């Protein structure tokens, strides 16, 4: 018989995300060591450029 609107639609916006403490590099022969400080679980990813 009719249609009613579903209010409160999902719109894009901007919102901040934390920036973790940048690690210290302890580079060595064909390798690096990252000393990581993270009060909360943060995601680290690595990939080779080959």
């Amino acid at each position: 018989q009719g249609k009613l609107h579903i209010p409160f639609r999902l719109t894009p916006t901007v919102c901040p995300v934390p920036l973790a403490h940048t690690p210290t590099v302890m580079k060595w022969f064909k390798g690096i060591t990252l000393h990581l400080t993270a009060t909360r679980p943060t995601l680290l990813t690595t990939r080779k450029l080959g």
Partner: protein, 91 residues
């Protein structure tokens, strides 16, 4: 972070504050950067012009329904930025 004031029982469409002027934003590029009211902070008593960036009174102000401060948020693209506006209501 923006501080503005309105009077008690103020008429609709009256001036509140120039957001684009106080932020130092250029006037000819609000639409190019997609000036828009943030969906989290929606105020029925306030409305802002997208072209000029000037805040205006939308509905008639009433402390009894409000009570205090009025909170609003705007967001811009390229770069992604967020700004906060707070309005004090006199009695």
């Amino acid at each position: 972070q923006l501080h503005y004031t309105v009077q008690e029982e103020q008429e609709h469409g009256t001036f509140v504050g120039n957001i684009a002027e106080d932020l130092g934003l250029d006037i000819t590029k609000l639409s190019a950067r997609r000036f828009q009211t943030a969906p989290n902070s929606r105020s029925p008593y306030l409305e802002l012009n997208l072209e000029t960036g000037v805040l205006y009174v939308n509905e008639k102000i009433d402390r009894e329904q409000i009570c205090c401060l009025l909170h609003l948020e705007v967001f811009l693209e390229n770069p992604l930025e967020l700004f906060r506006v707070e309005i004090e209501v006199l009695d």
